[PDB]
Amino acid sequence: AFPELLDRVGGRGRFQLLQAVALVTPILWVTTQSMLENFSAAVPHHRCWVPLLDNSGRDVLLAVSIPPGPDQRPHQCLRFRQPQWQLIADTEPCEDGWVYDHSTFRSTIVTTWDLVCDSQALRPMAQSIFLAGILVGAAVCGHASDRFGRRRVLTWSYLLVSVSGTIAALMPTFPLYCLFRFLVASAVAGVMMNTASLLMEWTSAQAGPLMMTLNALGFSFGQVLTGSVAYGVRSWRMLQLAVSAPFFLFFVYSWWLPESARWLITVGRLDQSLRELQRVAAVNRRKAEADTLTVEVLRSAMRLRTFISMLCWFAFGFTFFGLALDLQALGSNIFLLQALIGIVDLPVKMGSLLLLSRLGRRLCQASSLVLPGLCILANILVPREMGILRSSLAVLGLGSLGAAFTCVTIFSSELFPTVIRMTAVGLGQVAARGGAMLGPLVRLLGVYGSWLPLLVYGVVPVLSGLAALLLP
Ligand SMILES: O=c1[nH]c(=O)c2[nH]c(=O)[nH]c2[nH]1
């Protein structure tokens, strides 16, 4: 009977726009704190420290000091014991530390804590820890919004994000940085889930398309904001502080947003719900039917397809979050990538959905997975002679892959008895945030050929899309 009360008090109107913008704005920085593991932990070119060079023909000393490496570059993990002046066998690893290339990045975490050479596996583990934090935070926060309300949890998660992000930029050792990033990720997941729920509840029966489109648009613009901010600040200690500073002001101004009315009814807090409904009525300027709200009215108010959807969600999350955090090795000009993903995401998603919806829902679902799979797979075949083709295909593939997040949510998830769609979207998202755990760990397979990670990241979505055609 709550929709009757909502229609009595409003619907569309003015408040549902102000609240919408005030909740969409943090999504950009939420995206920023997730893809920030791309300009902070960036690996520049590194070499062994030499006593002859860098104080106690420069090319001649470079040749006589470091043995040549395989990839037409000086070796990054070995050094001559003595200057081999025979050059106009016995090699030994560094102890004096490495020297880095300070031309684009002033200081990275790899620069700070020397996560190179033997200690290489640690870098693709920070993102796995972050995704574990997101998964745990999303799992725990589910049974947290039924006892503590829904508006309070949002404010406390904003404060937690701000405090943990600020503190993490002041740690002197790696494990504490990983722990604070874990906390940041959990709080961010809580923020995202609560924002989605609060957007869903307060609006009318038209909640489906508009708000779920606005959330995706917020993520897409958050990508561009990440790119811009990264272009702005270059140091890594000054990047985390600059990114996490706004969240305190967000916690400050989110202290006045009306709490969800539907939840207050189910718990018996009738007086607060009545006051909240009256204030939204005053804001919406529909102070005509609010008289009928006289408390007594509210007192009286008080298996194949699941497998396929789970597989699609797992493939999307796995490949996307295992391939969207390594744009450094995918091309060049890292600031133009990660800032062209959303610009190639929104138009492609509107156009592809518009052109494909008419042909069929299953056709659109399958076509949104095999196409990016081949798009990614064709990247390894083309040579490095042309870089524009080396970069365009991957960008297009990632943009099309991002369209699956919308295609398998709004047009899909109806593959069920059709009672209500919120019983399956959460279960599908369980895999997504569980599969991205098993993501960047694939990049640990850089040894034993470098084409294997890309081959896997291309094969998995292709197989998922091909199997999606086997619904009957
Ligand atoms: O691969 C993803 N996993 C998620 O858990 C998630 N959440 C979100 O908003 N976008 C995505 N993408």
Side-chain angles (χ1 to χ4, degrees), residues 1-218 220-472:
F2 194 87
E4 261 282 356
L5 259 300
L6 191 40
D7 203 58
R8 173 131 63 235
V9 86
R12 193 253 307 259
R14 214 155 282 265
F15 168 81
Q16 290 174 231
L17 171 153
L18 171 145
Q19 164 153 297
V21 75
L23 302 172
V24 162
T25 309
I27 308 301
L28 276 72
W29 307 94
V30 152
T31 278
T32 291
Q33 293 247 12
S34 316
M35 298 267 188
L36 205 52
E37 262 294 357
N38 209 357
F39 312 92
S40 178
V43 197
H45 301 166
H46 32 72
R47 101 185 155 182
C48 208
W49 158 274
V50 183
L52 205 172
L53 192 45
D54 323 290
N55 231 18
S56 74
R58 164 162 188 279
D59 322 71
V60 200
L61 290 320
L62 189 38
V64 82
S65 44
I66 317 289
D71 164 78
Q72 279 311 119
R73 283 267 105 173
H75 205 205
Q76 330 169 336
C77 274
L78 269 161
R79 190 159 83 85
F80 274 135
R81 204 151 301 91
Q82 323 144 356
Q84 303 288 294
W85 278 314
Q86 325 159 37
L87 171 153
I88 316 297
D90 253 28
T91 43
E92 172 275 359
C94 304
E95 37 281 44
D96 311 1
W98 294 258
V99 83
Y100 300 82
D101 186 334
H102 281 157
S103 320
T104 280
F105 287 117
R106 293 192 91 231
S107 45
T108 48
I109 84 170
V110 202
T111 285
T112 290
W113 284 320
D114 281 332
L115 312 183
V116 297
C117 267
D118 309 304
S119 36
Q120 172 146 39
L122 309 181
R123 166 167 147 63
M125 290 215 178
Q127 300 147 51
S128 191
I129 284 300
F130 188 90
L131 270 286
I134 278 174
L135 185 46
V136 152
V140 163
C141 278
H143 181 208
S145 45
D146 292 14
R147 170 57 173 127
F148 269 33
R150 174 142 323 156
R151 209 273 333 267
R152 287 152 60 75
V153 186
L154 194 67
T155 71
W156 291 124
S157 45
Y158 282 163
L159 171 68
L160 191 62
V161 154
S162 150
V163 163
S164 272
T166 278
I167 278 283
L170 306 175
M171 263 318 94
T173 39
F174 197 66
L176 293 152
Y177 173 85
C178 275
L179 160 81
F180 284 126
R181 282 293 262 152
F182 174 96
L183 286 200
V184 160
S186 92
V188 152
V191 152
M192 271 185 318
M193 162 185 98
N194 264 347
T195 278
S197 211
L198 187 45
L199 260 184
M200 266 215 196
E201 285 199 20
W202 256 110
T203 168
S204 58
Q206 287 340 291
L210 267 276
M211 303 337 193
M212 299 314 81
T213 296
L214 257 289
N215 202 28
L217 179 141
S220 283
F221 277 142
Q223 313 261 358
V224 172
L225 182 49
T226 278
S228 301
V229 165
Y231 175 68
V233 202
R234 289 291 170 75
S235 181
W236 96 268
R237 297 223 191 254
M238 282 304 199
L239 193 45
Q240 204 81 1
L241 277 189
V243 164
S244 302
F247 273 95
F248 174 72
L249 278 298
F250 278 56
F251 152 90
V252 174
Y253 85 111
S254 96
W255 207 253
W256 307 4
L257 296 181
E259 177 174 332
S260 158
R262 197 198 206 185
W263 176 85
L264 277 179
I265 279 195
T266 83
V267 292
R269 314 204 173 143
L270 307 161
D271 325 312
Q272 263 315 114
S273 77
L274 261 286
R275 203 162 270 270
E276 292 265 317
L277 268 167
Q278 296 224 19
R279 70 167 319 161
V280 201
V283 169
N284 195 167
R285 218 180 290 211
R286 271 264 302 246
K287 196 209 53 59
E289 304 272 305
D291 178 359
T292 311
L293 282 86
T294 83
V295 157
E296 286 38 42
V297 187
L298 291 314
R299 283 242 55 244
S300 287
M302 194 270 256
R303 325 285 195 146
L304 312 93
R305 303 172 180 176
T306 313
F307 190 158
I308 300 315
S309 173
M310 192 146 68
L311 172 83
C312 172
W313 279 105
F314 175 94
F316 149 72
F318 171 48
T319 82
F320 184 79
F321 264 124
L323 198 62
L325 286 90
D326 74 322
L327 291 158
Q328 152 197 308
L330 183 53
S332 150
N333 195 306
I334 317 107
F335 308 110
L336 208 52
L337 277 77
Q338 194 42 98
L340 270 203
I341 297 287
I343 320 188
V344 85
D345 193 344
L346 306 167
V348 81
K349 72 186 303 283
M350 328 313 250
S352 188
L353 176 131
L354 188 61
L355 173 74
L356 266 296
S357 164
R358 308 250 301 182
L359 258 68
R361 335 289 181 278
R362 47 182 298 114
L363 294 75
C364 190
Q365 164 55 45
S367 178
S368 199
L369 255 55
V370 54
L371 189 272
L374 283 292
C375 216
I376 303 190
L377 201 41
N379 194 5
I380 60 153
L381 270 311
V382 299
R384 194 171 30 270
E385 145 192 328
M386 302 285 168
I388 318 144
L389 202 43
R390 208 251 188 285
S391 46
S392 307
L393 262 287
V395 172
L396 196 44
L398 290 183
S400 37
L401 211 52
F405 181 42
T406 296
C407 171
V408 80
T409 189
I410 317 302
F411 259 136
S412 291
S413 93
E414 53 87 16
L415 279 76
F416 82 114
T418 320
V419 169
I420 191 68
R421 72 149 46 79
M422 51 67 78
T423 68
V425 171
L427 192 32
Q429 295 225 136
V430 177
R433 343 174 145 272
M437 191 95 88
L438 303 183
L441 271 194
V442 161
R443 261 197 277 107
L444 203 33
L445 252 64
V447 192
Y448 176 37
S450 90
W451 44 269
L452 257 185
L454 293 212
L455 181 150
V456 157
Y457 283 137
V459 153
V460 154
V462 158
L463 263 279
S464 169
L466 176 87
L469 274 190
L470 264 284
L471 210 65

PDB file of all heavy atoms in Angstrom, residues 47-68:
ATOM      1  N   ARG A  47      66.609   0.498 -13.362  1.00  0.00           N
ATOM      2  CA  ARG A  47      67.924  -0.079 -13.597  1.00  0.00           C
ATOM      3  C   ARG A  47      68.662  -0.209 -12.270  1.00  0.00           C
ATOM      4  O   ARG A  47      68.284   0.393 -11.263  1.00  0.00           O
ATOM      5  CB  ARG A  47      68.729   0.772 -14.589  1.00  0.00           C
ATOM      6  CG  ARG A  47      69.768   1.676 -13.944  1.00  0.00           C
ATOM      7  CD  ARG A  47      70.444   2.578 -14.957  1.00  0.00           C
ATOM      8  NE  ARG A  47      70.957   3.790 -14.329  1.00  0.00           N
ATOM      9  CZ  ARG A  47      71.564   4.772 -14.980  1.00  0.00           C
ATOM     10  NH1 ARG A  47      71.760   4.717 -16.287  1.00  0.00           N
ATOM     11  NH2 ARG A  47      71.984   5.837 -14.303  1.00  0.00           N
ATOM     12  N   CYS A  48      69.729  -1.005 -12.271  1.00  0.00           N
ATOM     13  CA  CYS A  48      70.562  -1.166 -11.087  1.00  0.00           C
ATOM     14  C   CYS A  48      71.444   0.055 -10.865  1.00  0.00           C
ATOM     15  O   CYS A  48      71.970   0.643 -11.813  1.00  0.00           O
ATOM     16  CB  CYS A  48      71.440  -2.413 -11.194  1.00  0.00           C
ATOM     17  SG  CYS A  48      71.864  -3.135  -9.589  1.00  0.00           S
ATOM     18  N   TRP A  49      71.599   0.429  -9.597  1.00  0.00           N
ATOM     19  CA  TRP A  49      72.507   1.506  -9.233  1.00  0.00           C
ATOM     20  C   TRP A  49      73.949   1.108  -9.525  1.00  0.00           C
ATOM     21  O   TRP A  49      74.363  -0.025  -9.264  1.00  0.00           O
ATOM     22  CB  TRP A  49      72.336   1.855  -7.755  1.00  0.00           C
ATOM     23  CG  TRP A  49      73.506   2.555  -7.135  1.00  0.00           C
ATOM     24  CD1 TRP A  49      74.613   1.975  -6.586  1.00  0.00           C
ATOM     25  CD2 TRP A  49      73.679   3.968  -6.985  1.00  0.00           C
ATOM     26  NE1 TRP A  49      75.468   2.938  -6.112  1.00  0.00           N
ATOM     27  CE2 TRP A  49      74.917   4.172  -6.345  1.00  0.00           C
ATOM     28  CE3 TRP A  49      72.910   5.082  -7.335  1.00  0.00           C
ATOM     29  CZ2 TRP A  49      75.404   5.441  -6.046  1.00  0.00           C
ATOM     30  CZ3 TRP A  49      73.394   6.342  -7.036  1.00  0.00           C
ATOM     31  CH2 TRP A  49      74.629   6.511  -6.399  1.00  0.00           C
ATOM     32  N   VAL A  50      74.715   2.051 -10.061  1.00  0.00           N
ATOM     33  CA  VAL A  50      76.112   1.819 -10.422  1.00  0.00           C
ATOM     34  C   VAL A  50      76.978   2.786  -9.623  1.00  0.00           C
ATOM     35  O   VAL A  50      76.574   3.936  -9.411  1.00  0.00           O
ATOM     36  CB  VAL A  50      76.326   1.994 -11.935  1.00  0.00           C
ATOM     37  CG1 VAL A  50      77.764   1.691 -12.324  1.00  0.00           C
ATOM     38  CG2 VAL A  50      75.367   1.106 -12.710  1.00  0.00           C
ATOM     39  N   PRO A  51      78.150   2.370  -9.134  1.00  0.00           N
ATOM     40  CA  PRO A  51      79.042   3.331  -8.473  1.00  0.00           C
ATOM     41  C   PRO A  51      79.722   4.260  -9.465  1.00  0.00           C
ATOM     42  O   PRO A  51      80.005   5.419  -9.145  1.00  0.00           O
ATOM     43  CB  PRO A  51      80.059   2.433  -7.756  1.00  0.00           C
ATOM     44  CG  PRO A  51      80.052   1.169  -8.537  1.00  0.00           C
ATOM     45  CD  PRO A  51      78.635   0.988  -8.992  1.00  0.00           C
ATOM     46  N   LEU A  52      79.994   3.758 -10.671  1.00  0.00           N
ATOM     47  CA  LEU A  52      80.640   4.586 -11.685  1.00  0.00           C
ATOM     48  C   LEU A  52      79.702   5.690 -12.159  1.00  0.00           C
ATOM     49  O   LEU A  52      80.117   6.841 -12.334  1.00  0.00           O
ATOM     50  CB  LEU A  52      81.099   3.711 -12.855  1.00  0.00           C
ATOM     51  CG  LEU A  52      82.256   4.169 -13.754  1.00  0.00           C
ATOM     52  CD1 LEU A  52      82.653   3.046 -14.702  1.00  0.00           C
ATOM     53  CD2 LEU A  52      81.935   5.431 -14.542  1.00  0.00           C
ATOM     54  N   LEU A  53      78.432   5.358 -12.362  1.00  0.00           N
ATOM     55  CA  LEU A  53      77.438   6.324 -12.797  1.00  0.00           C
ATOM     56  C   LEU A  53      76.675   6.862 -11.588  1.00  0.00           C
ATOM     57  O   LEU A  53      76.772   6.335 -10.479  1.00  0.00           O
ATOM     58  CB  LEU A  53      76.496   5.680 -13.817  1.00  0.00           C
ATOM     59  CG  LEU A  53      75.542   6.561 -14.626  1.00  0.00           C
ATOM     60  CD1 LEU A  53      76.267   7.791 -15.147  1.00  0.00           C
ATOM     61  CD2 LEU A  53      74.947   5.766 -15.774  1.00  0.00           C
ATOM     62  N   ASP A  54      75.921   7.941 -11.808  1.00  0.00           N
ATOM     63  CA  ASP A  54      75.159   8.599 -10.745  1.00  0.00           C
ATOM     64  C   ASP A  54      76.067   8.995  -9.583  1.00  0.00           C
ATOM     65  O   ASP A  54      75.709   8.856  -8.411  1.00  0.00           O
ATOM     66  CB  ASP A  54      74.007   7.715 -10.259  1.00  0.00           C
ATOM     67  CG  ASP A  54      73.359   6.927 -11.382  1.00  0.00           C
ATOM     68  OD1 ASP A  54      72.675   7.544 -12.225  1.00  0.00           O
ATOM     69  OD2 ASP A  54      73.534   5.691 -11.419  1.00  0.00           O
ATOM     70  N   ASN A  55      77.264   9.482  -9.922  1.00  0.00           N
ATOM     71  CA  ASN A  55      78.273   9.899  -8.953  1.00  0.00           C
ATOM     72  C   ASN A  55      78.683   8.747  -8.040  1.00  0.00           C
ATOM     73  O   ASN A  55      78.294   7.597  -8.265  1.00  0.00           O
ATOM     74  CB  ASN A  55      77.770  11.086  -8.128  1.00  0.00           C
ATOM     75  CG  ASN A  55      78.754  12.238  -8.106  1.00  0.00           C
ATOM     76  OD1 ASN A  55      79.655  12.314  -8.941  1.00  0.00           O
ATOM     77  ND2 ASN A  55      78.584  13.143  -7.151  1.00  0.00           N
ATOM     78  N   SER A  56      79.477   9.044  -7.016  1.00  0.00           N
ATOM     79  CA  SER A  56      79.965   8.012  -6.106  1.00  0.00           C
ATOM     80  C   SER A  56      78.944   7.695  -5.019  1.00  0.00           C
ATOM     81  O   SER A  56      79.298   7.209  -3.944  1.00  0.00           O
ATOM     82  CB  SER A  56      81.289   8.442  -5.470  1.00  0.00           C
ATOM     83  OG  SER A  56      81.083   9.444  -4.489  1.00  0.00           O
ATOM     84  N   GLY A  57      81.811   9.157 -22.484  1.00  0.00           N
ATOM     85  CA  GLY A  57      80.491   8.970 -23.056  1.00  0.00           C
ATOM     86  C   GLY A  57      79.559   8.177 -22.161  1.00  0.00           C
ATOM     87  O   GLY A  57      79.800   7.002 -21.897  1.00  0.00           O
ATOM     88  N   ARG A  58      78.482   8.830 -21.712  1.00  0.00           N
ATOM     89  CA  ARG A  58      77.543   8.196 -20.788  1.00  0.00           C
ATOM     90  C   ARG A  58      77.003   6.887 -21.352  1.00  0.00           C
ATOM     91  O   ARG A  58      76.783   5.923 -20.606  1.00  0.00           O
ATOM     92  CB  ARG A  58      76.405   9.169 -20.471  1.00  0.00           C
ATOM     93  CG  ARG A  58      75.166   8.546 -19.848  1.00  0.00           C
ATOM     94  CD  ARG A  58      74.314   9.617 -19.182  1.00  0.00           C
ATOM     95  NE  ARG A  58      73.206   9.062 -18.414  1.00  0.00           N
ATOM     96  CZ  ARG A  58      72.059   8.656 -18.939  1.00  0.00           C
ATOM     97  NH1 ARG A  58      71.833   8.722 -20.241  1.00  0.00           N
ATOM     98  NH2 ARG A  58      71.112   8.176 -18.137  1.00  0.00           N
ATOM     99  N   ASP A  59      76.794   6.828 -22.668  1.00  0.00           N
ATOM    100  CA  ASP A  59      76.365   5.581 -23.294  1.00  0.00           C
ATOM    101  C   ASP A  59      77.418   4.492 -23.132  1.00  0.00           C
ATOM    102  O   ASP A  59      77.079   3.319 -22.935  1.00  0.00           O
ATOM    103  CB  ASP A  59      76.058   5.817 -24.772  1.00  0.00           C
ATOM    104  CG  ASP A  59      75.394   7.157 -25.022  1.00  0.00           C
ATOM    105  OD1 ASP A  59      76.080   8.193 -24.895  1.00  0.00           O
ATOM    106  OD2 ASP A  59      74.188   7.172 -25.345  1.00  0.00           O
ATOM    107  N   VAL A  60      78.699   4.858 -23.215  1.00  0.00           N
ATOM    108  CA  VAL A  60      79.764   3.871 -23.056  1.00  0.00           C
ATOM    109  C   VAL A  60      79.757   3.297 -21.645  1.00  0.00           C
ATOM    110  O   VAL A  60      79.905   2.083 -21.455  1.00  0.00           O
ATOM    111  CB  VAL A  60      81.128   4.492 -23.410  1.00  0.00           C
ATOM    112  CG1 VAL A  60      82.139   3.400 -23.728  1.00  0.00           C
ATOM    113  CG2 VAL A  60      80.984   5.451 -24.582  1.00  0.00           C
ATOM    114  N   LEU A  61      79.595   4.154 -20.634  1.00  0.00           N
ATOM    115  CA  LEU A  61      79.514   3.657 -19.263  1.00  0.00           C
ATOM    116  C   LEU A  61      78.274   2.794 -19.061  1.00  0.00           C
ATOM    117  O   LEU A  61      78.326   1.777 -18.359  1.00  0.00           O
ATOM    118  CB  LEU A  61      79.530   4.815 -18.263  1.00  0.00           C
ATOM    119  CG  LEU A  61      80.837   5.597 -18.081  1.00  0.00           C
ATOM    120  CD1 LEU A  61      82.036   4.654 -18.084  1.00  0.00           C
ATOM    121  CD2 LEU A  61      81.010   6.709 -19.100  1.00  0.00           C
ATOM    122  N   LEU A  62      77.149   3.184 -19.666  1.00  0.00           N
ATOM    123  CA  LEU A  62      75.945   2.365 -19.569  1.00  0.00           C
ATOM    124  C   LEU A  62      76.171   0.984 -20.175  1.00  0.00           C
ATOM    125  O   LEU A  62      75.748  -0.029 -19.606  1.00  0.00           O
ATOM    126  CB  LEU A  62      74.775   3.067 -20.256  1.00  0.00           C
ATOM    127  CG  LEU A  62      73.391   2.442 -20.064  1.00  0.00           C
ATOM    128  CD1 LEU A  62      73.220   1.912 -18.648  1.00  0.00           C
ATOM    129  CD2 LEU A  62      72.297   3.442 -20.404  1.00  0.00           C
ATOM    130  N   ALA A  63      76.837   0.927 -21.330  1.00  0.00           N
ATOM    131  CA  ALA A  63      77.114  -0.355 -21.968  1.00  0.00           C
ATOM    132  C   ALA A  63      78.084  -1.191 -21.142  1.00  0.00           C
ATOM    133  O   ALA A  63      77.925  -2.413 -21.035  1.00  0.00           O
ATOM    134  CB  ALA A  63      77.662  -0.132 -23.377  1.00  0.00           C
ATOM    135  N   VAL A  64      79.098  -0.554 -20.552  1.00  0.00           N
ATOM    136  CA  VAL A  64      80.100  -1.296 -19.794  1.00  0.00           C
ATOM    137  C   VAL A  64      79.613  -1.669 -18.400  1.00  0.00           C
ATOM    138  O   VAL A  64      80.247  -2.497 -17.731  1.00  0.00           O
ATOM    139  CB  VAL A  64      81.407  -0.489 -19.697  1.00  0.00           C
ATOM    140  CG1 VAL A  64      81.323   0.539 -18.580  1.00  0.00           C
ATOM    141  CG2 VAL A  64      82.599  -1.409 -19.494  1.00  0.00           C
ATOM    142  N   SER A  65      78.502  -1.095 -17.942  1.00  0.00           N
ATOM    143  CA  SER A  65      78.047  -1.335 -16.578  1.00  0.00           C
ATOM    144  C   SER A  65      76.985  -2.425 -16.484  1.00  0.00           C
ATOM    145  O   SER A  65      77.144  -3.373 -15.709  1.00  0.00           O
ATOM    146  CB  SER A  65      77.507  -0.038 -15.975  1.00  0.00           C
ATOM    147  OG  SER A  65      76.676   0.637 -16.902  1.00  0.00           O
ATOM    148  N   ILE A  66      75.909  -2.313 -17.255  1.00  0.00           N
ATOM    149  CA  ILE A  66      74.759  -3.203 -17.155  1.00  0.00           C
ATOM    150  C   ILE A  66      74.742  -4.094 -18.385  1.00  0.00           C
ATOM    151  O   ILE A  66      74.851  -3.588 -19.505  1.00  0.00           O
ATOM    152  CB  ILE A  66      73.430  -2.434 -17.034  1.00  0.00           C
ATOM    153  CG1 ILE A  66      73.580  -1.261 -16.065  1.00  0.00           C
ATOM    154  CG2 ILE A  66      72.315  -3.361 -16.582  1.00  0.00           C
ATOM    155  CD1 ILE A  66      73.712  -1.678 -14.618  1.00  0.00           C
ATOM    156  N   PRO A  67      74.623  -5.416 -18.235  1.00  0.00           N
ATOM    157  CA  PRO A  67      74.521  -6.276 -19.411  1.00  0.00           C
ATOM    158  C   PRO A  67      73.242  -5.993 -20.175  1.00  0.00           C
ATOM    159  O   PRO A  67      72.209  -5.644 -19.577  1.00  0.00           O
ATOM    160  CB  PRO A  67      74.517  -7.696 -18.816  1.00  0.00           C
ATOM    161  CG  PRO A  67      75.002  -7.547 -17.414  1.00  0.00           C
ATOM    162  CD  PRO A  67      74.608  -6.180 -16.978  1.00  0.00           C
ATOM    163  N   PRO A  68      73.259  -6.124 -21.498  1.00  0.00           N
ATOM    164  CA  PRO A  68      72.047  -5.865 -22.281  1.00  0.00           C
ATOM    165  C   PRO A  68      70.953  -6.878 -21.980  1.00  0.00           C
ATOM    166  O   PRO A  68      71.214  -8.054 -21.718  1.00  0.00           O
ATOM    167  CB  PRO A  68      72.543  -5.987 -23.731  1.00  0.00           C
ATOM    168  CG  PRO A  68      74.058  -5.808 -23.596  1.00  0.00           C
ATOM    169  CD  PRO A  68      74.321  -6.622 -22.380  1.00  0.00           C
TER     170      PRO A  68
END
